[PDB]
Design a protein around this ligand. Sequence first.
Ligand SMILES: COc1c(-c2cc3ccc(NS(C)(=O)=O)cc3c(=O)o2)cc(-c2ccc[nH]c2=O)cc1C(C)(C)C
Length: 557
Amino acid sequence: HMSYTWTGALITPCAAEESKLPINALSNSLLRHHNMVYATTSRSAGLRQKKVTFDRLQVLDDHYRDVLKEMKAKASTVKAKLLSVEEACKLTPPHSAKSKFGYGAKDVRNLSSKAVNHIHSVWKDLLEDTVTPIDTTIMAKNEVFCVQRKPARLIVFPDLGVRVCEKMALYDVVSTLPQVVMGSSYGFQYSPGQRVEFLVNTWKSKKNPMGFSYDTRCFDSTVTENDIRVEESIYQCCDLAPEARQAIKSLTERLYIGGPLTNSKGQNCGYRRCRASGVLTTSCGNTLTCYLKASAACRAAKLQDCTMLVNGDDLVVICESAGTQEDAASLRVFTEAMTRYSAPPGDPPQPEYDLELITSCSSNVSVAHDASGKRVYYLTRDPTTPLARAAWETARHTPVNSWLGNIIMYAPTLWARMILMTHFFSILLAQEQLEKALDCQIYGACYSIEPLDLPQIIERLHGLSAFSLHSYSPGEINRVASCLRKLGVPPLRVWRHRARSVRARLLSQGGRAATCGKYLFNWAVKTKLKLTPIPAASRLDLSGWFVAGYSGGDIYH
Ligand SMILES: COc1c(-c2cc3ccc(NS(C)(=O)=O)cc3c(=O)o2)cc(-c2ccc[nH]c2=O)cc1C(C)(C)C
């Protein structure tokens, strides 16, 4: 029961790959330790192949079937709709990988007769054939990190025509089913502020709280045929149109369970028998499976009052403590149950008795103070990877602007405000590109956003307090200052000086640029301006922002 089998053919790139941090005239103003930053390339794909390839053994007990029965009872209350070709076309990212059959993402988005006719023939084939394995492309992802080198992560995806069909059959399912099945445990329904609120309220709801994050080693590879069939039985609980049922069965049999792996040059690389990382159901499938195995493992370990928080393969459990030493033994049993369910740990989970010490989705809760001096909880993270990616983005245009996604998601943080906002607004001002829409990712979905709209976006997600936070915690300040010394990033005092200039330059432009100066950089001036609700923020359509996760799902909003 191997996750993969391989032919020996290489995982090949599509274009030139850079591993060394590109340098330009702007680089040194952000980061001096250039050799610390690198990008993964297809050169390390062979090492990743070794890591992801293993035998999976699964032992399913009564706790597993009991949780699954409860999940199916909730899933049966869901009604989902089939999307039209046209509706599914419009969810396609403008730079999504082109089809092998003579059309691309822009042809799909424009509803070109050629794209639409091929999609209809792919759909008809799904309904008529529920056996033939569907082809997939295997690629090495090019991602930027700081040293201490990771081999490239792999991406496995079917053709563009298949991806549009996945949307038609399952978009409504993967967007609505997880919150119904998992309720408040479904992480992707929350904005960062709502996630903090859920974590704080959960922690407070326990008499003697204990919390831990559970890291599964190579989660996609641990996903078995059983897991993928169990996910399909959950989707099948929904009230569906007859064509959607048939398409879901077909996609499960032909694509989700497994299939051949083809490199960018058209050679057969091998065969997958685990989760494909680049399908519509990757996020929903991972969330459901992680929640199922973990809820079952909690009952096996006799963990009292376990509240889960699940986002794909990312898991946080908050429960009642049985005493520090009993909690450590309880965690070893939870781990043994997860292992029998084919979800062994990367790092062994550690019990935590301080909410701020739990790391989940690379993040943690911290505390600052608003303008009135009131304690305010917010989400932060170690800024090393955001800063390594900002350095890359300073010298190269990339398909996804991580700095923009990081400013959006981490707007209240000391590091996003003082460094990311300051640096990138300075760059945009110099290029007169404040109005230019840029692509970013929020919970795996793609968005096109104008930097000029950041004050309204931030107000809507985090509230006006995101522009007034001060008196950050010593632990947070120390982590940021340490990260800056390690990367050779100028100290926070330099950023304050630069921000005063960026603020003045923005205010000088007037209009929307002045609003950016006023709201984003009020922290930089000694005599602070009174920050009132931005009229434009109320008009924002932010409906599908925090509904579901779509990592690898090829979604554009
Ligand atoms: C939910 O966790 C997040 C996540 C977050 C966490 C996460 C954890 C696990 C997975 N796993 S998977 C591939 O199986 O779906 C997928 C995801 C995912 O898509 O988004 C992502 C961000 C984020 C940061 C910067 C730009 N864009 C973003 O989406 C912020 C938060 C916080 C903790 C701040 C709410």
